[PDB]
Enzyme design. Sequence first.
Site, PDB file in Angstrom:
ATOM      1  N   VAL A 457       0.867  -1.170   0.000  1.00 29.66           N
ATOM      2  CA  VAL A 457       0.000   0.000   0.000  1.00 29.66           C
ATOM      3  C   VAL A 457       0.905   1.221   0.000  1.00 29.66           C
ATOM      4  O   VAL A 457       1.693   1.420   0.933  1.00 29.66           O
ATOM      5  CB  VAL A 457      -0.942   0.012   1.214  1.00 29.66           C
ATOM      6  CG1 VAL A 457      -2.072   1.006   0.995  1.00 29.66           C
ATOM      7  CG2 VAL A 457      -1.491  -1.372   1.482  1.00 29.66           C
ATOM      8  N   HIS A 458       0.801   2.032  -1.045  1.00 29.84           N
ATOM      9  CA  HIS A 458       1.728   3.133  -1.248  1.00 29.84           C
ATOM     10  C   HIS A 458       0.980   4.461  -1.187  1.00 29.84           C
ATOM     11  O   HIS A 458      -0.127   4.558  -1.696  1.00 29.84           O
ATOM     12  CB  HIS A 458       2.436   2.969  -2.594  1.00 29.84           C
ATOM     13  CG  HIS A 458       3.468   4.014  -2.876  1.00 29.84           C
ATOM     14  ND1 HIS A 458       4.682   4.057  -2.225  1.00 29.84           N
ATOM     15  CD2 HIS A 458       3.474   5.048  -3.749  1.00 29.84           C
ATOM     16  CE1 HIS A 458       5.387   5.077  -2.680  1.00 29.84           C
ATOM     17  NE2 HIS A 458       4.678   5.693  -3.607  1.00 29.84           N
ATOM     18  N   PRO A 459       1.555   5.483  -0.533  1.00 27.40           N
ATOM     19  CA  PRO A 459       2.754   5.503   0.310  1.00 27.40           C
ATOM     20  C   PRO A 459       2.438   5.246   1.783  1.00 27.40           C
ATOM     21  O   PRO A 459       1.647   5.979   2.376  1.00 27.40           O
ATOM     22  CB  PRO A 459       3.297   6.927   0.121  1.00 27.40           C
ATOM     23  CG  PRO A 459       2.389   7.594  -0.887  1.00 27.40           C
ATOM     24  CD  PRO A 459       1.103   6.849  -0.826  1.00 27.40           C
ATOM     25  N   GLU A 463       4.346  -0.360   4.172  1.00 28.29           N
ATOM     26  CA  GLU A 463       4.802  -0.858   2.881  1.00 28.29           C
ATOM     27  C   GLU A 463       6.166  -1.529   2.977  1.00 28.29           C
ATOM     28  O   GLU A 463       6.432  -2.502   2.264  1.00 28.29           O
ATOM     29  CB  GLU A 463       4.847   0.312   1.901  1.00 28.29           C
ATOM     30  CG  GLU A 463       5.216  -0.024   0.481  1.00 28.29           C
ATOM     31  CD  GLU A 463       5.127   1.193  -0.416  1.00 28.29           C
ATOM     32  OE1 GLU A 463       5.104   1.025  -1.651  1.00 28.29           O
ATOM     33  OE2 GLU A 463       5.072   2.320   0.118  1.00 28.29           O
TER      34      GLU A 463
END
EC number: 1.8.1.12
Lengths: 485, 486
Positions: A457-459, A463
């Site tokens: 899952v960014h940002p 992560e």
Amino acid sequence: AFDLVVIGAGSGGLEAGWNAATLYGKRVAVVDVQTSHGPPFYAALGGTCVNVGCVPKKLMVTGAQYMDHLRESAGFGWEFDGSSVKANWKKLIAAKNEAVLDINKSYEGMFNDTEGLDFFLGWGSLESKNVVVVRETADPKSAVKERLQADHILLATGSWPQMPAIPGIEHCISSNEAFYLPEPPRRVLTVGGGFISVEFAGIFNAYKPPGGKVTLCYRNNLILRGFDETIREEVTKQLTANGIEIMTNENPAKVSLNTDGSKHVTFESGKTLDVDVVMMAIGRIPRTNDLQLGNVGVKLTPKGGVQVDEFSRTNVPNIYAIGDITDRLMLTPVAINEGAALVDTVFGNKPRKTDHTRVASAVFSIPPIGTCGLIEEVAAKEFEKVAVYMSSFTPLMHNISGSKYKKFVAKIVTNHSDGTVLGVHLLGDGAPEIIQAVGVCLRLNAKISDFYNTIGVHPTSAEELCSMRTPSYYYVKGEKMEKLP
Amino acid sequence: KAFDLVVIGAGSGGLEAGWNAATLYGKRVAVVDVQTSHGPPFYAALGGTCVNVGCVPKKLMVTGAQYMDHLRESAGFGWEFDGSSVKANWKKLIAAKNEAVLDINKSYEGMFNDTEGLDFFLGWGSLESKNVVVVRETADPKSAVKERLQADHILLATGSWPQMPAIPGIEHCISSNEAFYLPEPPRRVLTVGGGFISVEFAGIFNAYKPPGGKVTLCYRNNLILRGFDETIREEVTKQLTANGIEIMTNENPAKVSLNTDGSKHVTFESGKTLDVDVVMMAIGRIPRTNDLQLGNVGVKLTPKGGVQVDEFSRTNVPNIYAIGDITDRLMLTPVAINEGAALVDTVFGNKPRKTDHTRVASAVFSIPPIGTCGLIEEVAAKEFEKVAVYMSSFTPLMHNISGSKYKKFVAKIVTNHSDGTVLGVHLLGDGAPEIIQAVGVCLRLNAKISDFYNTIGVHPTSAEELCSMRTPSYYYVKGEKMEKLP
Ligand SMILES: Cc1cc2nc3c(=O)[nH]c(=O)nc-3n(C[C@H](O)[C@H](O)[C@H](O)COP(=O)(O)OP(=O)(O)OC[C@H]3O[C@@H](n4cnc5c(N)ncnc54)[C@H](O)[C@@H]3O)c2cc1C
Ligand SMILES: Cc1cc2nc3c(=O)[nH]c(=O)nc-3n(C[C@H](O)[C@H](O)[C@H](O)COP(=O)(O)OP(=O)(O)OC[C@H]3O[C@@H](n4cnc5c(N)ncnc54)[C@H](O)[C@@H]3O)c2cc1C
Ligand SMILES: C(#Cc1nc(-c2ccc3c(ccn3C[C@@H]3CCCN3)c2)sc1C1(N2CCCC2)CCCCC1)CNCC1CCC1
Ligand SMILES: C(#Cc1nc(-c2ccc3c(ccn3C[C@@H]3CCCN3)c2)sc1C1(N2CCCC2)CCCCC1)CNCC1CCC1
């Protein structure tokens, strides 16, 4: 007579009582020394966590984090009259007090609306294998208020702060009194390397009046013993970066009062320090001295805890013990799990024992810690091949915030034979929330490949746990080395 | 100039593929992009849309917007200061944000300079033939040639582009690209669209608007954030409204005209009107196929517009591949990275890997944010006989003290009730993006509901709610919603 009498209306005592009464219609009694938070006894209905533990601790750390928010907001264009800023400690405590008292009242109401679940105000103790006496005070000679007949007795009185035997110890406080200081100390010394001393150091650092200084001292070389060592060294640095003085290899020897009411601290090394508050946070010991366990023969462990088997049973039949009094994992959710498991086994046909491995905990320091599983040096003595995955980085915002020192640390420890994850250790904002679902991962015996093959899952900082595919170093037969032979 | 791999588009997916092929398999790689740093005229650049005009800047500016809540909420914990002296400087936010992105641009340029077999070319890529990527000075096929890159393998990775509706006055509107460089914060602003881009920018503009401002979000249907869990869609609508953002559902702009002072006069299809200083269109993003000359070699597009690819990112033309937003599936950066890494493993490492597009965790950085992974209950009900929904919603204690009582946390777990497998998790509240990450690891392991509530919780956290739900709140049997089972 009662199917069960619980001494201690805390995290474990209340879960065991509520379940036995509402799930199995059993007759339950519960004893605690107060009905609402605060002096003289501090803990009360609700337990250490509700009254002088996790709940007010979390609220006061949240309040302390605003010192960083106000400073960091300028990196994003926010301005305001800095000279008008005041950290009002008396309002923080008032808001905490009202939040805790609301919990006290709702438990009060719980007892008044649940048949088979009664509360008794007083000090509980063992008169015999089947009788819990309730006296007016911890004094065994104080007046009797009740004598509760019990087919089962549950010891769940928690723990109590440890205080060293030095001259002037009476002038020092523990975490109990810190929750009720009328004013925020300008100069404070927190004694100890554990999570309570670190957490309260951050709290005092935020609310100290102008000209203040928080000093933390620890008798050995590195604080937060028992946590991942990379995190221990990094948290030491980031505390220092925010103004806290960390004083390792030092220990108080005597404390006297100065003519103004402040305390003169002499250390074993001869060093001296004048402070307004000295908070002893060197440990928590099981709270057993008021229970008169000798009247009945309940055995203790060498280090003072009530000895139990994996089902929470003492050597005396039908007497059980859960929570901090057992001197294992002093965590609220553990005591809840032990309480619920006990009642299921005794008052149901579903034997259940709580797993004390792979439990996720947190430290609400500034910055916070999240951990679950083994640290590497322990795994190195339990597994032939151990791999350590390490990753440090500066989160996006702290390139702008003005807090470059806030480095995030993520470490994964595996059994390198099959990649099974043995421990995960996080340092940085969000870590306590990240680690909960990591605990689920380790019940399912997740392997390192299960982490880095999951899409990120960014940002996010979390992560990073899915971005590590190659060990940074190993342990073979307990020996640290970068590359394998 | 005989390359193993030529990448058109130095973005999230393109950069991962070029770096892996060069550093892991010693292949000679060329990567093409139109700029080396963020901003006009082309906005995206070396690093991709995420680095330059997407996730990264978006995140920094949402973080700055969150300080409007921090400063107000600090009073509940004893913090006192002159409230009338609080001001938000938009030019400082942009300037700081530009510095941070440029640091990433600079870092990527040093990567190319120092890595063997990894060369960067400035210009516009396009297909001349099956084995030749041509680079020109502009996107126009008539512009001058700079190089003809001979390629054994070609990767299309040009991302997507904001979609602009063909209404009169569209030329007075912007997209998210221009919003990142606005010289001033708009006093009044209309974000058009119900997706995450529009919602996230509404939050940004709401925090930095000058006095007497208002953010209005409009969406042509009834409820915003289609695709997400319906409970959360309704709650974010409430919590955006609670923080001052007017939501305008079932409305769609029909034209825009200029006022005398330069503001925009918006007329909606319903005849309503509104005057704003900026109109930001965020109705969608379409795959960026217009400049690649795909017809020259015959790369097929889907009926939807994206480059058709099989599960291994292969197009209909051998040795030509496509990943990322141009394939028009999940337009997320970590997916484009995963697709690029799987492509190189298959092509060059004889290590056939393919990307799993199910159970992908993602976030919305609204205020408060969203974290989600897996199926929503509406979709699981059409696909499973018995479905169960575990639901917990409440205002955290800190937000009673903080004064933001509207900030209700929402945790929801969707399961196949026949064996308890967790199909989806959906979060609304502070920390939701960070919580949901490891939830993706759980769903990768086919975790069951019991795996969650038999895990010991971390106290006090929002996340521990996920481990204290053991009785369904309601069910879906044969697609029908009911509270109890038959
Ligand atoms: C400052 C601080 C912060 C903490 N933070 C956290 C945290 O963030 N997370 C976490 O998991 N844990 C935390 N803990 C630990 C947590 O509070 C305990 O592990 C938890 O309370 C479990 O203890 P228990 O339920 O066994 O007993 P407790 O919950 O402590 O309850 C014991 C109760 O028994 C009563 N009692 C004692 N003796 C008698 C007697 N003779 N007669 C009648 N009643 C009696 C006491 O008044 C007390 O209410 C913290 C502790 C402290 C001190
Ligand atoms: C405002 C916004 C916010 C977002 N936030 C998030 C988020 O929080 N999380 C998330 O996961 N995703 C987010 N995304 C999506 C994410 O940015 C994209 O999914 C991702 O960047 C796609 O990567 P890609 O490799 O497909 O192509 P891109 O990363 O878009 O890169 C394509 C590159 O190719 C170049 N190019 C185009 N045409 C040519 C040509 N003819 N020749 C040479 N070069 C060319 C472009 O300059 C561009 O740099 C966001 C997007 C936007 C617009
Ligand atoms: C809580 C609670 C709670 N409130 C109750 C309750 C509350 C009110 C009650 C009654 C019975 C009567 N009342 C009064 C009525 C009903 C609510 C108000 N009016 C019972 S029963 C109850 C629970 N037990 C109390 C002691 C621990 C187990 C815990 C939560 C699940 C239900 C049982 C918060 N849990 C957080 C902790 C921190 C680690 C987990
Ligand atoms: C990253 C990165 C990254 N930097 C690299 C890199 C960076 C600098 C390099 C080299 C090779 C040489 N240099 C120059 C060095 C720098 C100091 C001395 N010279 C390689 S390699 C690299 C990785 N990818 C390559 C293509 C882009 C991603 C991701 C991290 C693992 C290694 C590969 C993430 N940036 C954070 C933001 C948040 C959104 C993106």
